[PDB]
């Protein structure tokens, strides 16, 4: 799996190094079972290199099993020549995350952090309803920051004990915050905000309707 | 049924026209057939058709086979997408979807 990104892409044609994608394609030729992944290939559609990939994709044979998966966020602004049959045909629509995907990603982001066993996650799953996958990955860092603040602050008073005497000294580490408790999520949830609105998810639904979407005659049957 | 599944994108006001074009195309031939029958040269009483011959008593097959040639769909594809887009302007039960009450 190789991966080139947006700013690595358009810095070719901002400095007129257009004939510099042949190396990133034959490097993919050398490793035979790869899947080279563009990312935000509409980044040059703010004002070429789409043609430089376009003359290269048809010259690439099919016995090699390299695949070209490209991602975008403004699917209407893309060049329609990329959608000709032979070059890039399938148009898979990735929706917003549903409930089971939400609980999966929420458990997935908390592998490293020790979480308290009574911290529920199914109740946190179906409460966040229209949240994108990049928004609820933020609150499981805001809660970690909100617990690290209290774990730094709790060590201040323990060394700043007035008349810090050897009598009744805690030889054991007290560990006031050993793991993320419940009220950290209960306080970190207050700053949550959905990033994607409703007015722009209708744009992707409308582009999905711009694909004709199996509409017309419908069912017919062969004669007997 | 064969005329049903052949006309595919036709609106309901377009195929109500071809079952008047076929009627007009048969009335033309039924008017024209009576012209020669009265304009028989040496119209003699010998071998006279006392019975009405009735050349077109009903609409035959080739009237529809000829009237179909002038068919045209009125509504395009570009304007049915406008009503589908207005149907998408209604939010159309989209959002959260299924949830369940707790037990």
UniProtKB/Swiss-Prot annotation, chain B:
The modification N6-acetyllysine is found at residue 82. Residues 36-55 are annotated as: Disordered. Phosphorylated by tyrosine kinases in response to T-cell antigen receptor activation. Phosphorylated in mitotic cells. The modification Phosphoserine is found at residues 30, 98, 103. It is found in: Cytoplasm, Cytosol; Endoplasmic reticulum; Nucleus; Cytoplasm, Stress granule. Homohexamer. Forms a ring-shaped particle of 12.5 nm diameter, that displays 6-fold radial symmetry. Part of a ternary complex containing STX5A, NSFL1C and VCP. NSFL1C forms a homotrimer that binds to one end of a VCP homohexamer. The complex binds to membranes enriched in phosphatidylethanolamine-containing lipids and promotes Golgi membrane fusion. Binds to a heterodimer of NPLOC4 and UFD1, binding to this heterodimer inhibits Golgi-membrane fusion. Interaction with VCIP135 leads to dissociation of the complex via ATP hydrolysis by VCP. Necessary for the fragmentation of Golgi stacks during mitosis and for their reassembly after mitosis. Involved in the formation of the transitional endoplasmic reticulum (tER). The transfer of membranes from the endoplasmic reticulum to the Golgi apparatus occurs via 50-70 nm transition vesicles which derive from part-rough, part-smooth transitional elements of the endoplasmic reticulum (tER). Vesicle budding from the tER is an ATP-dependent process. The PIM (PUB-interaction motif) motif mediates interaction with the PUB domain of RNF31. It is linked to Inclusion body myopathy with early-onset Paget disease with or without frontotemporal dementia 1: An autosomal dominant disease characterized by disabling muscle weakness clinically resembling to limb girdle muscular dystrophy, osteolytic bone lesions consistent with Paget disease, and premature frontotemporal dementia. Clinical features show incomplete penetrance. Frontotemporal dementia and/or amyotrophic lateral sclerosis 6: A neurodegenerative disorder characterized by frontotemporal dementia and/or amyotrophic lateral sclerosis in affected individuals. There is high intrafamilial variation. Frontotemporal dementia (FTD) is characterized by frontal and temporal lobe atrophy associated with neuronal loss, gliosis, and dementia. Patients exhibit progressive changes in social, behavioral, and/or language function. Belongs to the AAA ATPase family. This is Transitional endoplasmic reticulum ATPase. The lineage of its organism: Eukaryota, Metazoa, Chordata, Craniata, Vertebrata. The chain holds residues 673 to 775 of 806 of the full protein.
